[PDB]
Design an enzyme around this catalytic site. Structure first.
Site, PDB file in Angstrom:
ATOM      1  N   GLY A 161       0.748  -1.301   0.116  1.00 15.23           N
ATOM      2  CA  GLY A 161       0.052   0.009   0.007  1.00 15.23           C
ATOM      3  C   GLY A 161       0.657   1.335  -0.028  1.00 15.23           C
ATOM      4  O   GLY A 161       0.374   2.426   0.157  1.00 15.23           O
TER       5      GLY A 161
ATOM      6  N   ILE B 158      -4.240  -0.819   2.644  1.00 15.05           N
ATOM      7  CA  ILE B 158      -5.103  -0.730   1.273  1.00 15.05           C
ATOM      8  C   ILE B 158      -6.488  -0.480   1.358  1.00 15.05           C
ATOM      9  O   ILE B 158      -7.159  -1.253   2.358  1.00 15.05           O
ATOM     10  CB  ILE B 158      -4.781  -1.957   0.404  1.00 15.05           C
ATOM     11  CG1 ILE B 158      -3.393  -2.262   0.144  1.00 15.05           C
ATOM     12  CG2 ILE B 158      -5.853  -2.173  -0.817  1.00 15.05           C
ATOM     13  CD1 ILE B 158      -3.058  -3.602  -0.260  1.00 15.05           C
TER      14      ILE B 158
ATOM     15  N   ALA C  65     -12.596   3.283  -2.808  1.00 15.66           N
ATOM     16  CA  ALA C  65     -13.862   3.431  -2.929  1.00 15.66           C
ATOM     17  C   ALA C  65     -14.145   4.488  -4.009  1.00 15.66           C
ATOM     18  O   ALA C  65     -13.104   5.281  -4.123  1.00 15.66           O
ATOM     19  CB  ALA C  65     -14.841   3.749  -1.618  1.00 15.66           C
TER      20      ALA C  65
ATOM     21  N   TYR D 189     -17.722  10.100   4.885  1.00 16.70           N
ATOM     22  CA  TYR D 189     -16.840   8.702   4.757  1.00 16.70           C
ATOM     23  C   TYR D 189     -17.978   7.606   4.206  1.00 16.70           C
ATOM     24  O   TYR D 189     -17.458   6.983   3.324  1.00 16.70           O
ATOM     25  CB  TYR D 189     -16.325   8.469   6.283  1.00 16.70           C
ATOM     26  CG  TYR D 189     -15.206   7.430   6.280  1.00 16.70           C
ATOM     27  CD1 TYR D 189     -14.146   7.980   5.600  1.00 16.70           C
ATOM     28  CD2 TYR D 189     -15.360   6.220   7.063  1.00 16.70           C
ATOM     29  CE1 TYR D 189     -13.001   6.991   5.616  1.00 16.70           C
ATOM     30  CE2 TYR D 189     -14.138   5.434   7.267  1.00 16.70           C
ATOM     31  CZ  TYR D 189     -13.095   5.822   6.304  1.00 16.70           C
ATOM     32  OH  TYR D 189     -11.806   4.796   6.356  1.00 16.70           O
TER      33      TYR D 189
ATOM     34  N   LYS E  69     -14.999  -0.143   6.609  1.00 16.61           N
ATOM     35  CA  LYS E  69     -14.180  -0.251   7.489  1.00 16.61           C
ATOM     36  C   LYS E  69     -14.836  -1.185   8.509  1.00 16.61           C
ATOM     37  O   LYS E  69     -14.148  -1.767   9.483  1.00 16.61           O
ATOM     38  CB  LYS E  69     -13.579   0.812   8.248  1.00 16.61           C
ATOM     39  CG  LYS E  69     -12.665   1.768   7.232  1.00 16.61           C
ATOM     40  CD  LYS E  69     -11.469   0.871   6.833  1.00 16.61           C
ATOM     41  CE  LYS E  69     -10.552   1.970   6.007  1.00 16.61           C
ATOM     42  NZ  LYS E  69      -9.177   1.260   5.639  1.00 16.61           N
TER      43      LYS E  69
ATOM     44  N   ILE F 149      -4.759  11.948   8.379  1.00 21.63           N
ATOM     45  CA  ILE F 149      -3.438  12.303   7.784  1.00 21.63           C
ATOM     46  C   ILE F 149      -3.762  12.699   6.459  1.00 21.63           C
ATOM     47  O   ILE F 149      -4.350  11.895   5.811  1.00 21.63           O
ATOM     48  CB  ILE F 149      -2.598  11.086   8.121  1.00 21.63           C
ATOM     49  CG1 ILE F 149      -2.445  10.528   9.764  1.00 21.63           C
ATOM     50  CG2 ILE F 149      -1.102  11.557   7.616  1.00 21.63           C
ATOM     51  CD1 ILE F 149      -1.533   9.380   9.855  1.00 21.63           C
ATOM     52  N   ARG F 150      -3.028  13.738   6.023  1.00 21.71           N
ATOM     53  CA  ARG F 150      -3.004  14.260   4.676  1.00 21.71           C
ATOM     54  C   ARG F 150      -2.259  13.261   3.668  1.00 21.71           C
ATOM     55  O   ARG F 150      -1.045  13.138   3.903  1.00 21.71           O
ATOM     56  CB  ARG F 150      -2.569  15.671   4.464  1.00 21.71           C
ATOM     57  CG  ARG F 150      -2.797  15.974   2.956  1.00 21.71           C
ATOM     58  CD  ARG F 150      -3.525  17.441   3.219  1.00 21.71           C
ATOM     59  NE  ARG F 150      -2.913  18.418   4.356  1.00 21.71           N
ATOM     60  CZ  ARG F 150      -3.804  19.281   4.649  1.00 21.71           C
ATOM     61  NH1 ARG F 150      -5.092  19.488   4.590  1.00 21.71           N
ATOM     62  NH2 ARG F 150      -3.099  20.122   5.719  1.00 21.71           N
ATOM     63  N   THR F 151      -3.155  12.427   3.007  1.00 24.67           N
ATOM     64  CA  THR F 151      -2.480  11.488   1.903  1.00 24.67           C
ATOM     65  C   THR F 151      -2.955  11.487   0.651  1.00 24.67           C
ATOM     66  O   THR F 151      -4.084  12.274   0.448  1.00 24.67           O
ATOM     67  CB  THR F 151      -2.562  10.037   2.572  1.00 24.67           C
ATOM     68  OG1 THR F 151      -4.171   9.554   2.521  1.00 24.67           O
ATOM     69  CG2 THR F 151      -2.108   9.710   4.048  1.00 24.67           C
ATOM     70  N   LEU F 152      -2.565  10.850  -0.277  1.00 21.02           N
ATOM     71  CA  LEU F 152      -2.990  10.784  -1.418  1.00 21.02           C
ATOM     72  C   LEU F 152      -4.773  10.708  -1.582  1.00 21.02           C
ATOM     73  O   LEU F 152      -5.570  11.314  -2.046  1.00 21.02           O
ATOM     74  CB  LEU F 152      -2.353   9.789  -2.477  1.00 21.02           C
ATOM     75  CG  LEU F 152      -2.251  10.029  -3.799  1.00 21.02           C
ATOM     76  CD1 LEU F 152      -1.482  11.479  -4.092  1.00 21.02           C
ATOM     77  CD2 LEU F 152      -1.445   8.850  -4.316  1.00 21.02           C
TER      78      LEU F 152
END
Ligand SMILES: NC(=O)c1ccc[n+]([C@@H]2O[C@H](COP(=O)([O-])OP(=O)(O)OC[C@H]3O[C@@H](n4cnc5c(N)ncnc54)[C@H](O)[C@@H]3O)[C@@H](O)[C@H]2O)c1
Ligand SMILES: NC(=O)c1ccc[n+]([C@@H]2O[C@H](COP(=O)([O-])OP(=O)(O)OC[C@H]3O[C@@H](n4cnc5c(N)ncnc54)[C@H](O)[C@@H]3O)[C@@H](O)[C@H]2O)c1
Ligand SMILES: NC(=O)c1ccc[n+]([C@@H]2O[C@H](COP(=O)([O-])OP(=O)(O)OC[C@H]3O[C@@H](n4cnc5c(N)ncnc54)[C@H](O)[C@@H]3O)[C@@H](O)[C@H]2O)c1
Ligand SMILES: NC(=O)c1ccc[n+]([C@@H]2O[C@H](COP(=O)([O-])OP(=O)(O)OC[C@H]3O[C@@H](n4cnc5c(N)ncnc54)[C@H](O)[C@@H]3O)[C@@H](O)[C@H]2O)c1
Ligand SMILES: Oc1cc(Cl)ccc1Oc1ccc(Cl)cc1Cl
Ligand SMILES: Oc1cc(Cl)ccc1Oc1ccc(Cl)cc1Cl
Ligand SMILES: Oc1cc(Cl)ccc1Oc1ccc(Cl)cc1Cl
Ligand SMILES: Oc1cc(Cl)ccc1Oc1ccc(Cl)cc1Cl
Lengths: 256, 256, 256, 256
Positions: free
Chosen positions: B13, B94, B97, B157, B164, B193-196
């Site tokens: 991931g 991983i 959606a 979400y 989840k 958390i700021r991610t892709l």
């Protein structure tokens, strides 16, 4: 016995007289409700029509509704809307999983079997709510049935436990969504009951005896106990209750 | 600095330097582990490879692994087995959606989008565990990443919250299955958390500001805080811990 | 073996070599910590000092501290402040209830026995935290020990289960209070371990056998497994973890 | 409407007509119940006698019952026994904490304030159940009221949150005890309601606006919504329900 006077509910998931849905149907009827029944497929149509007819009063509408089929689901609730105009809730009593997935270890669950269980046992609540929303013009309650296996690990439940976890989370997200439209969404977590589908769970009799031995009320639960709790949730007594999971399981859920 | 000396973990991931998986990789490396990386498709090969390169004291094993593809998943862990013989755990980082499902109201989630999210974000833990089991011959830990939205309703979400919930139930049923073989299964529930992938969750800056203002620790989480909790769960220190979900979220989960 | 180098922790609740607190002390020491021990009264003084002396290095400070006694609690931590200046955490490993209250039905619990259990097993965490906060000027972690019986009904545990509920809630409210001061507060929920206090719980061999037979890891917990999780929670690895309850119970808590 | 016909319940905790216990009394009355009332001390005697008068006439049994006073509590239920013989339930609507312990940080909670809150708000349920057990010879239900603050951290609730955690655990252990005697034990977790005791909790108008904005049903709860759920739990409809905590809070509890 007039708690649900003037209200109409759709009951989905009657298969025979042992169905929890049939217990719910009886309790709702006894509380003054009018009922619409849906059945999964042709194989079950006469069982459901015959049971519906044993109710005294006007003849109940009985419609086909395979929840894996969007076209049929849409058509089913379109018919309902046109024929009765307003309904005040839906009892969603539907689940399925492949028996081979239920028997093996959870780690050996097939991908297709996992997704099928999710589709029928969890997503179908949302698909149903989406269509039911249109016909519940004065609000009301959507109810589904879950099991302790969706919260904690119970033997021989495996893939269905994970599907019930999805279902219980769906109840919460749907409650949050539909509340502003005056629609409540709740679950009943029933203790083990001998139904047609209980045969999928291994050694059901050991399970029942365990409930009798260890549950606080020292007895197993009944369809009527679940139906009478459904009566509360569908009634105006429960108007402050949404996104809840009420255990009707003789208290078994509290044990560690 | 030597908690994981002599051990090898598969990290699934990583997509870029902000990936939580990359925080986990760095922490495991800092604790002495050797690392193997899998990446989702051709478009990610170079980037994952570039990052994996920067780990000194080891050469890189970096393999394609689309977790929707059973032939590729099986082949990937067979290659891992042949290259290193034994691994001591897997970090499953991983999820996916469709954007349109995440933006709409939950009740409007599509059937295919629901099943896609379940397939990639929840069932894949089981598919991975079934293969990893074959290479974890000295036991160890399988870790996945979850979010508060699987337990309670968080805004925007939706379908991922339900995936989840499914993932978290899977952690428990898998823990119960694999424990007899000395394999533990746990989750980390990370704060935002700021991610892709955070791009698909709307109004993210305000979500972060909320954490900063309200969380007990009055600050947002980092990939490294999650990584260091992974160090614990993958280590012998956590040998008594399985079926657990550790919140690494500055305490936010306790708030009502 | 250097996670906790340069740090000093107060360990409260060693009574003999089987105490969970003594498992925690050994793990913290092995991780490089300096330790301070407190003991309940004169009868335990010999045991605790003998155990502390087995640790390589400078003899640890050992002090009396009855957590029901506010004057002594205050004097104890003032002595700690004068002796070491700064501490980096506290392990609260203290509980008590009258053995008659553990035997009878919970409904027959005496008022004084209920309040005694609450005072020693729950409120003492808060009393300790209030003094510890004065000496933890660089932040750190406060740890307590709880049991599954605080979450669900476990046989014979009765009044202690209610005190552990109180304790677990206190962990959350304290985490919310103290986080802004850099202080984390967490619990470990240990599985059954044969200790001095385990004599108070009936049919303990039967309980251990059930754990061995049904827990995911098919074995009972050890003081060392708890101690090693405490090392994590006290270390910088857990800096994002607060208000958490980590089960170190071979996975038993997941079972329904 | 006739759900409770021919059954007698003890309502404890009426202070004035804004009391949640008074909402409960009205709903039980409307369901056909006969009611007995208790009052804390002489300061509230007139209020309770007069309100009882509006429902039951000057016939009604209205009795002093300070739940900190074991002599008075025992005498109260002894009077009930020889005046009416059998009752079918008790509504326990009693809590107290010092206002100082509700404003300061939780870590500054006084020992005697903590024990006082536990004594009145949590242990009283058990002391009441022990006496009620003797006069509930046909079985029935014991009800208490709790708040989300017993499950998760809510601002300005502090010591009462920890007392509600105790209360909620007591509901479970009591249910496990009394179920074999045909007595069910349950809680209603009510959302915020402007009562006499709500003044203890700071900026209450702000809290109410929060519920209105964010709760799924977009409205605050009422005493009548709580009373109507109480009717369900006291009725035969709930005969399968024990050790449960039903949130009557417009769905707010599902939110993260
Ligand atoms: N029996 C128990 O002990 C128990 C306990 C807890 C929860 N439940 C739940 O109660 C519900 C009802 O099950 P039951 O025990 O009454 O058994 P059942 O076999 O009587 O009911 C299951 C129903 O699901 C229907 N269904 C399956 N696939 C469908 C599809 N594609 N489209 C439409 N309907 C479909 C079946 O036709 C049947 O009517 C299920 O959700 C089950 O998980 C049962
Ligand atoms: N970012 C957060 O705030 C946050 C919080 C809690 C949990 N999480 C979880 O952490 C995990 C990692 O997410 P992230 O935020 O680091 O984002 P990310 O985009 O960096 O990582 C998600 C990864 O999933 C991979 N993936 C998607 N489809 C795949 C497939 N078919 N086969 C294999 N891999 C596939 C992507 O390639 C990517 O590497 C996810 O499970 C996410 O839900 C994230
Ligand atoms: N033993 C288990 O299986 C188990 C499982 C889960 C949790 N726990 C918890 O672990 C903790 C430690 O218990 P243990 O099993 O190690 O037993 P133990 O008897 O070794 O330790 C209990 C300690 O509490 C101390 N204590 C009692 N009253 C005190 C007072 N007034 N002031 C100060 N100290 C006081 C005793 O002196 C003793 O040191 C307790 O909180 C217990 O509830 C134990
Ligand atoms: N008001 C809310 O928003 C809210 C929300 C959730 C739960 N609750 C709970 O509902 C219950 C009723 O509170 P309320 O809001 O109706 O307030 P209230 O002030 O009307 O009722 C509290 C009652 O407790 C009684 N009481 C206190 N000490 C007592 C003692 N020593 N002996 C006997 N009785 C004693 C008081 O006399 C009073 O009748 C409490 O348990 C409260 O915690 C209230
Ligand atoms: O959820 C259930 C729980 C129990 Cl204890 C018994 C029966 C249940 O219902 C099902 C179980 C398996 C399948 Cl395939 C379908 C259904 Cl309806
Ligand atoms: O789970 C997450 C939670 C947060 Cl707060 C932020 C990002 C997350 O991760 C994802 C969110 C959406 C999709 Cl499509 C895929 C992933 Cl990996
Ligand atoms: O909490 C515990 C749980 C278990 Cl299974 C065993 C021992 C425990 O510890 C105690 C039990 C009773 C008393 Cl009187 C005091 C303590 Cl320290
Ligand atoms: O529990 C409550 C929760 C809310 Cl939101 C409001 C009032 C409540 O009830 C109390 C609060 C404080 C004290 Cl001193 C006593 C009681 Cl009865």
């Amino acid at each position: 016995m007039e708690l649900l006077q003037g209200k109409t509910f759709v009951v989905m998931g009657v298969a025979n007289q042992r169905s929890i849905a049939w217990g719910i149907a009886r309790s709702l009827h006894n509380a003054g409700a009018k009922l619409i029944f849906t059945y999964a497929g042709e194989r079950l149509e006469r069982n459901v029509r015959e049971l519906a007819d044993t109710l005294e009063g006007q003849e109940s509408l009985v419609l086909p509704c395979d929840v894996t089929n969007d076209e049929e689901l849409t058509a089913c609730f379109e018919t309902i809307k046109q024929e009765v105009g307003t309904i005040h809730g839906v009892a969603h009593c539907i689940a399925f999983a492949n028996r081979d997935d239920l028997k093996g270890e959870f780690v050996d669950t097939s991908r297709d079997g996992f997704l099928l269980a999710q589709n029928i046992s969890a997503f179908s609540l949302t698909a149903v709510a989406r269509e039911a929303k249109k016909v519940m013009t004065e609000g009301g309650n959507i109810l589904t049935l879950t099991y302790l296996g969706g919260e904690r690990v119970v033997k021989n439940y495996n893939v269905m436990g994970v599907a019930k976890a999805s279902l219980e989370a769906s109840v919460k997200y749907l409650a949050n969504d539909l509340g502003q439209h005056g629609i409540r969404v709740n679950a009943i977590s029933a203790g083990p009951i001998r139904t047609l589908s209980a045969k999928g769970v291994g050694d059901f009799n050991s399970i029942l005896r365990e409930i009798e031995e260890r549950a606080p009320l020292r007895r197993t639960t009944t369809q009527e106990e679940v139906g009478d709790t459904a009566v509360f949730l569908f009634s105006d007594l429960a108007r402050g209750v949404t996104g809840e999971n009420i255990h009707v399981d003789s208290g078994y859920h509290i044990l560690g």
